[PDB]
Amino acid sequence: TXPGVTXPGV
Amino acid sequence: XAXVXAXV
DNA sequence: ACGCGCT
DNA sequence: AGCGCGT
Numbered sequence: 001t002x003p004g005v006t007x008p009g010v
Numbered sequence: 011x012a013x014v015x016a017x018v
Numbered sequence: 019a020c021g022c023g024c025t
Numbered sequence: 026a027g028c029g030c031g032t
């Protein structure tokens with residue numbers, strides 16, 4: 001995720 | 011991702 | 019003293 | 026496996 005906590009997605 | 015001072 | 023989080 | 030950090 002994020003970044004952070006990429007995306008989702010990308 | 012770990013949170014020990016900042017937790018990202 | 020340290021890794022988490024889905025589309 | 027490389028992203029996102031500071032008490």
Ligand SMILES: *C(=O)c1cnc2ccccc2n1
Pocket residue numbers: 004011012018021022029030
């Ligand atoms: C969390 O799992 C994690 C891992 N590496 C990092 C590098 C820089 C900032 C934050 C981070 N968080």
